[PDB]
Design brief:
The structure is cut from a larger assembly and holds 5 copies of chain A (about 350 residues). By secondary structure, chain A is of the alpha+beta class. Chain A has 12 helices and 11 strands. Bound molecules: adenosine-5'-diphosphate (5 copies). Chains A, B, C, D, E: Belongs to the PI3/PI4-kinase family. Type II PI4K subfamily.
Chain lengths: ~350, ~350, ~350, ~350, ~350
């Protein structure tokens, strides 16, 4: 039926279902479905429920203006949410970037903080580090988010969607990180471990966790890690855990012009001088020294980063070339028993494919 | 010294002081000075003080999204504030209006609500009606106003102005109306005065006040007056007062295309059938039937409306021509003992100068 | 003679001499005259002489591509020269910057490295620190500088200027820093002073010099100071000196978005914990805590920065506002006997005029 | 399978391999492969090797700025290299040429010197003259070539390509001519042969070689042949050879507006008055008087000239029409025993197809 | 007071009165004042009066769509009115004409019919022919004129101008010709004078009038004169008069490309063969053969033609150059006793100044 009526009708059968698919693409996303992580999805529903019951997320007070504590219906904090459009450069949406170079000193893509934040968690899972609290790209609407004058007015009138859904403020895409309880700024503890040293067993545990922090921040080439930016939880009577929490400024697209800019602040710690353990070597080497893993990782990141209205395939290859070079350095340092300090001293490399 | 060095230096003496004047024009305005109404200025300082002490204005809950209850340092409400840029059409700032007609059905200027609001009070004062609570154009900055992502971030860092003023969020221009206490929606009372009629003396007082409402709304050709939009205060053991409160949609630039659109809802009330009193006649006629008063009024409005970044001298003349025609009708109705109802039935007139 | 022939001829007398002045503006500059520093001028002539005798400046081998060792006619190094147009972003000359924001994460002006470099020396002199080797804006032409294909060809033919000057390659504007002899990377010594501590008197001298480094880098808010970027000279049988040498990335126009970015690497040294001395206090406070000095400094920088084809008065005020805030912090820390470490911990401030 | 899944997968099998082909087109070229001339390829590898070992090509001192002596790893000169982008008009790359006429006096294409240079050698081979030293289009990267500021900086960081190739400065396309040893400027010898005449046998040999020069320069309508521009090698105890070396200004697209412009300087020599030999007639006539040879030649040149980013099919036909007219004149002169002098006196002809 | 306050106030005294003058320029014109012809003005008032009393001008039925019979308040016809904007090419008002040639076959200016019509009458008066009924440029508003949808709607609402004038439909500029009574198409009579010849005295009178028609049409180079286009009035018991009535297609800006195009249809009449009389010679020669008269005429036309929004000084000089050439021919023919027929046979001349 290459030129038949039967086929002409088959082609319209596809044309109308493909046009319906594209109409229902925004609502499908905003449904926040995670077949792969039912546990994360449940948290999101708790967040949605709380909002219907008018227990809203609240701005983090001394934080940057664009991040909120998501609460459950009981008032407990359950997540940190950071909307894309409330990021520093969350304006200038009409891609202007291609007119700009057809630059520059800046080495991060303009408005993809939430993606960096989500990418970190992704890298974490694939590497099995379990230090970044599960964070994913989520849509949420709430009175307390920063909307424009028009959005706020346009949302007064009663609106229904047609399965008769009420519509309020538009949902915001953002990163949604599981909230972890009882941690403090890493430096608070590290200086306390300077007066009281820890028992050796606990200290061995701290270092094991620290190595995972180092691996994560190095592969994603985090741009903004201080010693207040990662967290340690220690309860005396005896576990110690680190959480990597603020990962919105990673995945750069080139190494910084100056090597002095954007240091990894954990490199000045004494912990950084301790050679990589055997444990970290056989958790990480079987992975990063296999092209298929790195291929698979790169495809995963591609999937995640595609989401963005401003995604640029050119930029993405630059991002992956940087990360490839980081993986390469890490492999060597892992093989030759180097320490985190030696690792950060290796010269930046780019690997083009 | 027509071409001398003495004059050349005199000319630079003016050129640098004129350039300083223009640099300091925004800070001068944002200082909110009212030599003419020291009482109003004091209220504003109370509002500024409360904000420094972190008692912020709060959104009016069931109102439109862009209006706030300004509180004093004790928590009492002292004003209603409505920022220009939080009005419905408070975007599209780059005047695009001239490219648009070089249209249309719309009969109000795009983003001058606060000016209408302030103009009402101005007309009120000049006419000596005392029904609009004193409202003026004021600048205010506060955490609870709707700022953009960038403004909120840009304001984290410590900024000083050089007399070392701290700088937080940018001040917003808006209308600042004195808050009046113990009124209810006009219809709440009017229907209660339908079961209980009032004692005749009080009723005479209500009508006297009502006539002033009618005069005000007619001269400014209010577009949006319901019987919930004006307020009556009545305390039994015996005064009755009206307040005209929501005047953001007045001063149109042409009469509505249809006469049925935008009625004055008070015209359906029985009160509207009562002929104008003598009292209102000799309060209003000595004024509006004298070209100098109307000239002086027009100059005052010009002064106030100039303030706006988008002010258009063309539009302004259209606004004044409408108001001139309203004044003209009002004069006749005032002379011939017509009622508010007859007045609103007269045909719309425009008076071009 | 306000409309006379005498004046008409006087006006043409000015019009032709003003047009000659503008023709001869480039040649006047390229003459490299320094009435204020005859000693510096002499060095420049030695540099010019060496070039005529075909002893050329040579690229600094492991340095960035745009810097040269200027040699005298005997082959000794006498200066470091860094051409404007060989800086990283030394292309994109047609100011495009105003079309770009009418952005961004970048906090340095695009192509003014040589100006930062010269500004450092300027600040140094005015403050009387004597740690930056005298560096100024100089023009030089040489075979070994990076010219374009056209410049190189266009310069084959014999060209004379009319006082019959030969013309070769076009002179390049750049920064010209006096070369200092016998220093090493600051970290080379600092780690040697970790094994051998110094005699206390010498150590007191090191610290005195260090404080001057701290003052300089803080006021110009250097963006790129490591502990390899400044130099210490120590000859045992007993003086010790610091030189501040690589100052091309200073004078930013806003504080960095993240406080973690661009640290002052000397803040992690133990020397940084030592409270400011009395000596530094009465060298620096009588100066920076007097508005006229700061006014005079700001005018000097204005003079220097004007030179640039891309100078922007808007950017310049941003640069001065940052530096004003740095001065302000420094003053406090100087008054309250704080250390360099405490100083760098103070929050970034901007001071707008 | 005209609309099958099998074919849809076959079509994607081609679409991805065609997209890979286009990605790997630049690296394929820069690999400098010459299956047809293994001997030339070997020289190129020697050149590449020398560069890795840091024995760089060096600018020809009294030559034009864009030509280099390529050295082998032992320091012997092995080639002359002339980069495209270092030619006089090697800027203005964004084809502007079509906007210019939709002109002019100029009769050479803008930036195809290296192509003229390579085309000469091509014509030489096909004609079997063996006077142009084998020259081809080659890519080379080297510190000593004229790169831009950005290229030089961008190349500091370590870059790998993925078969893990290091990347330094970008390779430059250019012409790569085999270096020939022991020749002098043709005029040096010709004036020496004016005092000492040569033995008749050697002189017969010189003339035989000269005729080949004449044939070559005439068919490619060289624009820039002096008597210093071609070379003679003569070693007394007895061979004599000519080399045609500087062929970057040939293959014009129209005859010069004036016949007096661009002469062939060898036409004023006495040698030019000697009638064409029989030897040259039966080497050249069986070739140029056969449409298939001329068709085949034209296709070869097309192949070579296509390479260029700025190739224009319009210009190319103009180039071939000129050369066709030259071939036509040459044929006549060859048939009628004319001399080089008579040949150059014939009127310029164009032959359009 | 060359730079005094007295003069600064004098300059504002002029600036405000000059701005008032320009505001009141349209209303001044639309007042239709004719101090020079009080008799014509009176007719216009009768026309205005009739319109107020709702006796409207009516479209001329078999005429072109843009002409009306103006009636007095009694219903008698008193004028013919032809609005500018109801002419054939009365659209395309935004001068596009200059973009068009920076053409063409067309030899009349685009939209100046009413001006031609008024110019004819002007030429008539100055020449003292008295055959064109007094026609001038007049403004009139009426329901029966062709207005646009918007004008018709915009005029429903009551509008006043401030001396409280009512405003209805906008006045139209047009030509206003006095209506003459009892004429017929010239050909109706001419063919009747072919059967009945006239008494010789009357015939002498006809010819005298005819000569004046010829003079008029020739000097203005009428483009559209048939023998139905001019009128003869003859009442038997004995005067005969001609009226020249339809003069909207005159004053061309170049002679027609073909001499056969646009003939003067009266040239085929036998009357045209009669030599010019003495009477016409001493009425017309003392005038047109004197440069001052022709200068004065040209200035008058300039005055009249300036009125038009689309007036072009370039076109006007072309119009005058044609008319100068016509005057020149006419003079000769007048001097040498030629007839109208010989006159029209003379070759077209242009006279440039
Ligand atoms: N997943 C998390 N669980 C618990 N606490 C968190 C988490 N993420 C952030 N926080 C805490 O809340 C604050 C959030 O700030 P951060 O994540 O740095 O973003 P921002 O600086 O943009 O506000 C931090 O001070 C940190 O102590
Ligand atoms: N000056 C005032 N004094 C006291 N109450 C006021 C005043 N202005 C408004 N209100 C009350 O607060 C609410 C403010 O809403 P309104 O002024 O209509 O603006 P919006 O509808 O934009 O919120 C009204 O419901 C009214 O009852
Ligand atoms: N004024 C100076 N006197 C002596 N040595 C210098 C001077 N300036 C720089 N140097 C030395 O030469 C090198 C120049 O590099 P630097 O000034 O950092 O610029 P870049 O990094 O752009 O080459 C440094 O390694 C430093 O050791
Ligand atoms: N293939 C070659 N073999 C040997 N010497 C050459 C060759 N090509 C050029 N030369 C010599 O080196 C110089 C190169 O200059 P030339 O080829 O004319 O180009 P340019 O004039 O652009 O430098 C010439 O003076 C010539 O003597
Ligand atoms: N001034 C006038 N007096 C009397 N009748 C006139 C006058 N002008 C025109 N007419 C008559 O009315 C008609 C008007 O048409 P005309 O003037 O030719 O313009 P159009 O052809 O554009 O309608 C003519 O047929 C003519 O007979």
């Amino acid at each position: 039926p290459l030129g038949s009526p039967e086929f002409a009708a088959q082609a319209q059968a596809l044309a109308a279902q493909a046009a319906a698919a594209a109409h229902a693409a925004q609502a499908h996303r905003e449904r926040n479905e995670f077949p792969e992580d039912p546990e994360f999805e449940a948290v999101v529903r708790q967040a949605e429920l709380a909002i219907e019951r008018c227990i809203f997320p609240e701005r983090i007070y001394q934080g940057s203006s664009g991040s909120y504590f998501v609460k459950d219906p009981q008032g407990r904090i359950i997540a940190v949410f950071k909307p894309k459009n409330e990021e520093p450069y969350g304006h200038l949406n009409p891609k202007w970037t291609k007119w700009l170079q057809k630059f520059g000193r800046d080495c991060l893509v303009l408005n993809q903080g939430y993606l960096s934040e989500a990418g970190a968690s992704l890298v974490d899972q694939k590497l099995e580090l379990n230090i970044v609290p599960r964070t994913k790209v989520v849509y949420l609407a709430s009175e307390t988010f920063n909307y424009s004058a028009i959005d706020r007015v346009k949302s007064r009138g009663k609106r229904l969607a047609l399965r008769f859904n009420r519509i309020g403020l538009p949902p915001k895409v953002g990163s949604f990180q599981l909230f972890v309880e009882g941690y403090k700024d890493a430096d608070y503890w590290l200086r306390r471990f300077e007066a009281e040293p820890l028992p050796e067993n606990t200290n061995r545990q701290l270092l094991l966790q620290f190595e995972r922090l180092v691996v994560l921040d190095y592969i994603i080439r985090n741009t903004d890690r201080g010693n207040d930016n990662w967290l340690i939880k220690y309860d005396c009577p005896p576990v110690i855990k680190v959480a990597a929490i603020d990962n919105g400024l990673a995945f750069p697209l080139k190494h910084p012009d100056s090597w002095r800019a954007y240091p990894f602040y954990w490199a000045w710690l004494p912990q950084a001088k301790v050679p990589f353990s055997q444990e970290i070597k056989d958790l990480i080497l079987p992975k990063i020294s296999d092209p298929n893993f790195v291929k698979d990782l790169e495809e995963d990141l591609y999937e995640l980063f595609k989401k963005d209205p401003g995604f640029d395939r050119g930029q993405f290859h630059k991002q992956i070339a940087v990360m490839r070079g980081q993986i390469l350095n890490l492999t060597q340092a892992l093989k030759d028993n180097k320490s985190p300090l030696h690792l950060v001293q290796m010269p930046p490399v780019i690997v083009e494919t």
